[model samples]
Target: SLRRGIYHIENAGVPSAIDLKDGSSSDGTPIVGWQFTPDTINWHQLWLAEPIPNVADTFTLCNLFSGTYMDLYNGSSEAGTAVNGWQGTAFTTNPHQLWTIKKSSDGTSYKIQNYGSKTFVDLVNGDSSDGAKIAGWTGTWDEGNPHQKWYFNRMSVSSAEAQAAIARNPHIHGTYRGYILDGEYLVLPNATFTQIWKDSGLPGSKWREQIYDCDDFAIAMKAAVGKWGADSWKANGFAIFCGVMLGVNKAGDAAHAYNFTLTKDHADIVFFEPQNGGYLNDIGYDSYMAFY
Candidate 1:
């Protein structure tokens, strides 16, 4: 079975995201494939965990707000049948609906393939713009690459961590544009990531000090990186990340850690899994709790 979780289907050709237009109603909407503009405030990105037996990269792509699955229009197999959002019934094994993910050349991205058209979910050629106007495509771009090269957009947090994130206020002291993990820097907090890397400490012998769990390693990085971001806390936009939060199952057990969350004010929040760094669109972890 594929990793269990929801995901956002994104594009490598463009900055827009793949989603249902409005996620309007329960009755469902036409090909809930919508896109978000460059300055996305609300994300239409939706996903679902694997519900089938040993099915990899195949799952129902649902609406973030409506809870509907992306279904084929009238069950059509033709090349241009619109894949819309529809309510999923007890029977969800239809071929016209589920989507399959294939890795791209870079191996870091993917393209969403559909069973309906036997083609791919693509951007409408010559379409107007973002946050909307998306469709399943049977063609390719000038460079021979389809725009559907997507990556997952969900934060892989456990039920407990999510709850903790929302249950309390984020006591994060800063924000940040990005990071640059360097050499022996993990051991030498005062040195630049450059200096650390030059010292031949690129996670080899440097990666081990003790147990070296992701959380501990990251926390150590934070201490060093924090010093670099020491001045950033005074500002807003480009600041150091707040901290990493530990996630747990609903029973509040185990030691699962999620990527650290930076300070916020997106107005619209985008929840994300730990590690892979990036920001999200409009939404909230309201029902979830906070880690820091």
Candidate 2:
């Protein structure tokens, strides 16, 4: 059974995910496949899979940014009809937007078949590049037929710390557009911290001096963790910290940005190099300021 939540719909044929073209909420926006970076807001690529009442495996995939339902062009019965976005309010029955998502023969991917057209959502020409058009096609799951296969990578939205952080309502000193924090700051378990750190995709990011240097990496990693936990509190029950550290050398004036997160299982903070994802020891820095 498909769990109801927001997801990034990745086509097995391409490395990209389904996106609402131009981030438009217009009724006729085209649905395309686009590459999304880890730091991207990606609102255009996120979809909310809502199951239809009393309909087995039937769902309405709606764009998160546009609030438009994914629909077959004109409810066409023909194969290769383009999949577009349409407003849900105007349609009476909305059969064109309804899709039956079932596990494909590959087991890892899914077959998204339109309820009215009975055609599977497919990538055009099996293209692997960004901005590729998606259409409805007739096909069975088989080897070398990945254009018709889709994978729903569930995005983290309702994790335990996310909820707890939302309740805590800690101060946020920085800005991360479109990302919402739902809970207060809480001490995290070491395992949960590891999982979020690994999932943030910060460790694999490229480092460009002056453009995407230390501060950028620190802020980016914090944004990712904030989207998950949204917590930054005092020593009472803090989970993570992001900011600048002052004075480490003999002259005591080496300023650098770093990451230090608190865990529930240990008294010491879990510090790491977000750029390389390596754990570090407490080097006894002079002082620091955190931006939650």
Candidate 3:
């Protein structure tokens, strides 16, 4: 699947055919033949610009359901052991375990599981801190601990570094964009044109972000209408809106727009739209501008 992030192209001309490359299978298929119309060309999207913080020192094995499990390295080497959902006193030996943040339930909490036992453990409330202790205690919400506390602030790097991260994880989505709302930071996903508003465990349905750059704010506008649709390119109103959000008069004017459309197979088709300035340059529409 085409990874998420901003994609760029040298032109908007259609291609003769679409070639789908599969590295794992060592096979290439012609998903779209000459009849395919390429609205845009030279597509690329950003991914994983920085390391995602494993706030919880103990990572969760989402597949596991219960009990203590041994944490193993990629080569099956033992890293440590993890316990879950138990009332026993803390391990006297301070049993070691390797954990990765599977997902954050909120800015301060996360849902975690053990490695070997595949048991589910909830870090009711947590944050990005080092040497936090991990406990199997239960609570109404996840609280930060050596096991649950984690830090996932975006790592700063050059554009080239950002691009390199995207190239490495072509399958990972939504690693390049973020939005600040009400003083909290939220990550934006590429699959949908929405921003994560709260850490309420609402899934993708609850993600929120401003509409069309920043001038507008709406819930669940179709991606086909804004950055995700090929037939419906970024309109002048949207581009100006983006400029205002970016705090620059011409911020998305030269930037290309693209969308990931749902295919018949329940997959996605990443398509690009050419960048044009005429509509955005019009002076008559400036009256609609407003700022919060």
For each candidate, what is the lDDT? 0.46, 0.64, 0.23
Q: Predictions ranked by TM-score, top down? A: 2, 1, 3
Q: What TM-score does each of the candidates earn?
A: 0.48, 0.56, 0.18
lDDT per residue as tens, model 2, 1-292:
7766666788886687888898787877888888876433465886767778778888888776676789899778777898998888322367889988988888988888898888888888877677788899887645448888888876533334343432332322233112323322333444555567678877678889779877777777777776664332111112233322222433545655656554332234445566776555543443234434
- lDDT accuracy of residue 28 in candidate 2: 77
TM-score of 2: 0.56
Q: Once superposed on the true structure, which residue ranges of model 1 sit more than 4 Å away at CA?
A: 26-28, 32-43, 49-51, 89-91, 126-128, 139-144, 158-292
| Per-candidate alpha-carbon RMSD to the true structure | 17.1, 12.0, 19.9
The numbered model that scores best in TM-score is 2
Per model, state how many residue pairs clash: 32, 9, 26
Extract clashing residue pairs from model 2. 165-183, 165-184, 166-182, 166-183, 166-184, 167-183, 167-184, 168-184, 169-184
Candidate 1 at residue 226, lDDT? 59
| Local accuracy of candidate 3 as per-residue lDDT tens digits, 147-196 | 33322222112333322332343222232332312111111232222221
User: Judged by lDDT, which candidate is best?
Assistant: 2
| Candidate 1: residue 245 lDDT (0-100) | 44
